[PDB]
Design a protein around this ligand. Structure first.
Ligand SMILES: COc1ccc2nc(C)c(O[C@@H]3C[C@H]4C(=O)N[C@]5(C(=O)NS(=O)(=O)C6(C)CC6)C[C@H]5/C=C\CCCCC[C@H](NC(=O)O[C@@H]5C[C@@H]6C[C@@H]6C5)C(=O)N4C3)nc2c1
Ligand SMILES: [Zn+2]
Length: 198
């Protein structure tokens, strides 16, 4: 009934992938209980830091990556949801279901990656466990893992970055090509597609 219809909660930042020093490591900044409460109100007062955020809904958890002042993630994780912020829910400024892409304004305190113009095919994928996986670019939006591993290790890392040797953002992790449960290649949203969407 109309009086009963509920509203989906906001995406909530629950942690980050720390790439500050020489050792990548995941940090949690908000627990389950706090995440639930923040998703309902859309009011997140936590300080935000870094380029790669760990984000959650009531049912999913994935990554979001800041590039050129926009926090990017995948549509199949975020849908059309708002993101929580200190002043309330923030509406998406980019939504493209054909690209599996959404974006909000980068939160205050975050840092943005620079789009890559190197043209290099030696990439690095950052997972939600702070694993840095070498990936060879095989096309406009595909890349192969130098060391294949079960898809279990990539699950929950959509929205994470593929980086060039210089640490520029080359793309956003979107999907995994699996053979008998082994991820041999990944699909990503090229940064050029982000720059065109912008
Ligand atoms: C609804 O509107 C839209 C619009 C566009 C759209 N576009 C997609 C390509 C898509 O695909 C979905 C989600 C994605 C995924 O799970 N992505 C992760 C990830 O981690 N998600 S997540 O855990 O964070 C989660 C679910 C958010 C919380 C990185 C993977 C990690 C492990 C894979 C797990 C088994 C799955 C293997 C699968 N493979 C594959 O589809 O391969 C194909 C497409 C291209 C390579 C070829 C053939 C795969 O990867 N999928 C399945 N849904 C949509 C939906
Ligand atoms: Zn580069």
């Amino acid at each position: 009934h109309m009086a009963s219809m509920k509203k989906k909660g906001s995406v909530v930042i629950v942690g980050r992938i720390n790439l500050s020093g020489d050792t990548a490591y995941a940090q949690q900044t908000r627990g389950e209980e706090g995440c639930q409460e923040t998703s309902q109100t859309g009011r997140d007062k936590n300080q935000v830091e870094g380029e790669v955020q760990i984000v959650s809904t009531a049912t999913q958890t994935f990554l979001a990556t800041s590039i050129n002042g926009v926090l990017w993630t995948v549509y199949h994780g975020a849908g059309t949801r708002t993101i929580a912020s200190p002043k309330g829910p923030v509406t998406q400024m980019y939504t493209n279901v054909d690209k599996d892409l959404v974006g909000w304004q980068a939160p205050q305190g975050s840092r943005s990656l620079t789009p890559c113009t190197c043209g290099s095919s030696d990439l690095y994928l950052v997972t939600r466990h702070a694993d840095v996986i070498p990936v060879r670019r095989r096309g406009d939006s595909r890349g192969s893992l130098l060391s294949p591993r079960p898809i279990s290790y990539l699950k929950g890392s959509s929205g994470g970055p593929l980086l060039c040797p210089a640490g520029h953002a080359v793309g956003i992790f979107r999907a995994a090509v699996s053979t008998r449960g082994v991820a041999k290649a990944v699909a990503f949203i090229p940064v050029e597609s982000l720059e065109t969407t912008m």
